[PDB]
């Protein structure tokens, strides 16, 4: 609940996770680099407070602008047999060897947001076209194609990939054959191909 | 909702003015084009009938 959002990068089965001496393994793991530049110190304090809260059996009051201090919560926690700042010794799951560093560990409220990958994944080979432009349709729900916009165009010029850019915008899209008159230059030719 | 419009960035409306204290939320506002123009009533607010 602190603007610390992420996607799952991999899953690990129970026995490969790091574990504390009590055999508790974390359910979800986040990265230490998310904290110092974002300065969501409240996220850490919530973890600390919730640890205390689950040991003694109540929901801590985390209302803003109260007399609750970090030291008061830390005092309670140490009196229950855990390190005062929330750390715990943990063991690497692959080898059983201790980690040289201790790991901040505890409950945190996490929320499941509406953006799931199988609602976004999309691919198109060939497919339906617009009646008017004979170009690929717009949108996931219509088997559409991605937009090669103006800024994409510029990048291929910078690479000097002139051949690639031609193919993308013709053979891989709405290529059409027309006949012109060599004298007047208009597309006014009437071409019956079976009568030649 | 404040119906001023997306056109015109401006350095007034979108901003959180001092007199909003206790009347509209200082935190809750959308990202993007509506940012600072759509606001939300603080918890104890009321509207005169």
């Amino acid at each position: 609940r602190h603007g610390q959002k992420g996607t799952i990068g991999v899953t690990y089965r129970h026995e490969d996770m790091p574990f504390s001496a009590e055999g508790i393994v974390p359910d979800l793991i986040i990265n230490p680099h998310a904290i110092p530049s974002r300065m969501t110190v409240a996220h850490l304090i919530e973890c600390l407070l919730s640890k205390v809260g689950s040991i003694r059996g109540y929901e801590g009051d985390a209302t803003p602008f109260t007399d609750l201090t970090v030291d008061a919560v830390s005092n309670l926690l140490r009196d229950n047999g855990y390190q005062s700042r929330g750390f715990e010794v943990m063991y690497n799951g692959h080898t059983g060897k201790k980690l040289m560093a201790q790991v901040f560990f505890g409950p945190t409220y996490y929320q499941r947001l509406r953006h799931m990958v199988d609602d976004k994944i999309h691919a198109r080979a060939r497919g339906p076209v617009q009646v008017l432009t004979r170009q690929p349709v717009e949108g996931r729900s219509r088997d559409g194609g991605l937009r090669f916009g103006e800024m994409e165009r510029d990048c291929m010029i910078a690479h000097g990939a002139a051949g690639f850019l031609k193919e993308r915008l013709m053979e891989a899209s709405d290529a059409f054959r027309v006949h012109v008159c060599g004298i007047c230059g208009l597309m006014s030719v009437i071409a019956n191909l079976k009568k030649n | 909702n404040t119906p001023i419009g997306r056109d015109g960035k401006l350095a007034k409306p979108r901003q959180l003015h001092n007199t909003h204290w206790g009347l509209v939320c200082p935190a809750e506002t959308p990202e993007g084009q509506a940012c600072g123009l759509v606001k939300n009533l603080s918890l104890l607010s009321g509207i005169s009938i």
Binding site: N31, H33, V103, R147, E167 | -
Partner: protein, 485 residues
């Protein structure tokens, strides 16, 4: 429709990182790999290979979707029940599934510069995300908080060659924008590589053997330990040096250090071996003249691309077994330092009182080009920003070397001096439109103050740290500055 348009053979999904992919690879979901296709022309050298794809059909990978004759008639392999009776003729085309080593153009909007579109080699993988090696997130300005990226498949022999020989990822390591690299070692691997190359990191024999084997380019010769007796021990600098190719020389001096290097700063590399120096952002970051730039000039783009993969695989393994964390304890300065911190803020509030006294008793020096009120506002702002920096400097120096916040700031991997200052000492002055908080209310900033109050607390100085917690008045002012951003 003409300067830009929608296109075939494209795909899009959420991206995830993978340290165990080469720099120029992209992991492509199986479902996407069965929908996209490439029309490979049938020749004498691949006709046997291509028939195997035809028997497997559109639903088993590696397979194929169409067979195109020279006249143009496509045979749709979903509905052809006599698929076993097709014999391929030279010159026909088979639209086979996307497969290993095929080059594809990868792209993440908005394309602001040319390294928003680079060619990667496709590696087919389970699950539904695109996988990127972690060192290419920087040129795309990509991260993995929900970003999506686009993939485009070239459709002919000519454009495959254009992609691999002009747009490929190793050719793009140095950018013409500032004649320096745009990719370096980032995040975990950069934080970890500082910790690993500290002077007192030692690794016993059993772990060393695994680390050497983790380097794909290793020549099979285990190097001699730095300590032979009473126990064989290698230093971190020796194993990192395995990942650097031979013949690389680099010298840099930080703060006039001697060759003895008491602070363990600077950098000296001789024949691809680290003599001394902690490896941090100044050496393996994206700065000009660093390690990555040097390998590029001496060895070319191919070798330099392996450098990223080698370093990453070693450090992430070592960091996995050392561990690293951060907790609430790391924001907390001890009781002695707080009194220093509190004094410097208390004395700064007194100087601001003196300035108000002088300005109201006509005893204040006028700054050139400025009215009295501008000069007054200018002097107060300078005092308060110097107060926070002074308080921040005190908090920083008290932190021990083992403190986890200090290790990330010192590595350069995330965070800076001001972040230590604001978490632990003092958030400092809040600004709106380049000025202090304005009198929105008639002659006052909030109805909890009296009128004509120009003190620090009245016009937006947040005295508390985020650790201590902000008071209600300070909170709103902080939300005003934050909104403006």
């Amino acid at each position: 429709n003409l300067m830009g348009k929608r296109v075939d053979f494209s795909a899009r999904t959420v991206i995830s990182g993978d340290p165990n992919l080469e720099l120029d690879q992209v992991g492509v979901p199986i479902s996407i790999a069965k929908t996209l296709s490439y029309p490979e022309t049938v020749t004498q050298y691949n006709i046997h290979r291509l028939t195997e794809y035809v028997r497997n059909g559109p639903n088993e990978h590696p397979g194929a979707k169409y067979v195109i004759r020279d006249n143009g008639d496509r045979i749709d392999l979903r509905y052809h029940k006599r698929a076993g009776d097709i014999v391929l003729q030279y010159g026909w085309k088979v639209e086979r599934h996307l497969m290993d080593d095929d080059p594809v153009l990868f792209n993440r909007q908005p394309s602001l510069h040319k390294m928003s579109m680079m060619a990667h080699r496709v590696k087919v993988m389970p699950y539904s995300t695109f996988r990127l090696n972690l060192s290419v997130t920087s040129p795309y300005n990509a991260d993995f908080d929900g970003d999506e990226m686009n993939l485009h498949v070239p459709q002919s022999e000519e454009t495959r060659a254009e992609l691999s020989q002009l747009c490929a990822v190793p050719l793009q390591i140095v950018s013409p924008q500032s004649n320096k690299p745009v990719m370096g070692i980032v995040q975990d691997t950069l934080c970890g590589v500082r910790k690993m190359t500290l002077r007192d990191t030692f690794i016993e024999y059993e772990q060393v053997m695994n680390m050497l084997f983790w380097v794909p380019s290793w020549d099979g010769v285990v190097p001699q330990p730095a300590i032979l007796k009473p126990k064989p021990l290698w230093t971190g600098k020796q194993l990192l040096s395995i990942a650097i190719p031979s013949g690389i020389h680099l010298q840099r001096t930080d703060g006039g250090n001697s060759l003895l290097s008491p602070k363990d700063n600077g950098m000296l590399i001789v024949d691809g071996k680290v003599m001394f120096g902690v490896v941090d952002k100044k050496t393996v970051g994206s700065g000009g003249g660093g390690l990555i730039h040097t390998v590029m000039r001496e060895k070319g783009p191919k070798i330099c691309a392996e450098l990223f993969g080698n370093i990453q695989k070693v450090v992430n393994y070592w960091l996995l077994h050392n561990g690293f964390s951060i907790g609430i304890g790391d924001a907390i300065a001890d009781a002695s330092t707080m009194k220093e911190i509190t004094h410097a803020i208390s004395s700064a509030k007194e100087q601001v009182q003196e300035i108000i006294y002088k300005a109201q008793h006509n005893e204040l020096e006028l700054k050139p080009g400025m009215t009295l009120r501008e000069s007054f506002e200018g002097e107060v702002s300078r005092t308060l920003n110097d107060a926070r920096d002074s308080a921040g400097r005190s908090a920083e120096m008290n932190l021990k070397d083992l403190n986890n916040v200090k290790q990330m700031v010192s590595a350069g991997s995330k965070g800076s001096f001001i972040n230590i200052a604001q978490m632990s000492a003092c958030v400092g002055q809040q600004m709106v439109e380049g000025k202090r908080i304005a009198f929105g209310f008639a002659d006052r900033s909030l109805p909890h103050f009296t009128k004509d109050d120009f003190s620090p607390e009245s016009k937006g100085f947040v005295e508390n740290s985020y650790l201590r917690g902000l008071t209600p008045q300070e909170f709103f002012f902080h939300a005003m500055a934050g909104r403006e951003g």
